[PDB]
């Protein structure tokens, strides 16, 4: 089912994307 | 089901796209 | 329909990485 | 259909992201 | 599928993610 698969990548997303703030302040 | 979480972690990246984007500015 | 959300996050998104575009000019 | 447009916006964030990418190295 | 293609060009958006963060590093 690629719709779990989906949900994982976003939340990746998000994770690597709050990183990506902490990094920029 | 996993519409609701695909919307919900769409949310939180446009919330951190806007971090990233108010940061630069 | 969820579906109208996400293609409208994803326009958000859209918008917002132009802006971080061209923010790093 | 609407799916259309969401790999239509994916597919354009990943274009801008790898743009992101040469304009932080 | 084209839920095949959303797979494939979320996994793009986290390398691309990561290789952001690894550049700011
Ligand atoms: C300056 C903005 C550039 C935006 C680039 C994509 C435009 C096409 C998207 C349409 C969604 C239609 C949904 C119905």
């Known amino acids: ?3 779990k698969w ?3 990548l976003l939340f ?3 994770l690597l994307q ?3 703030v ?3 302040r």
């Open 1 to 3: 089912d690629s719709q």
């Open 12 to 14: 990746l997303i998000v």
């Open 6 to 8: 989906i949900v994982f």
């Open 18 to 20: 709050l990183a990506i």
């Open 22 to 24: 902490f990094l920029l």
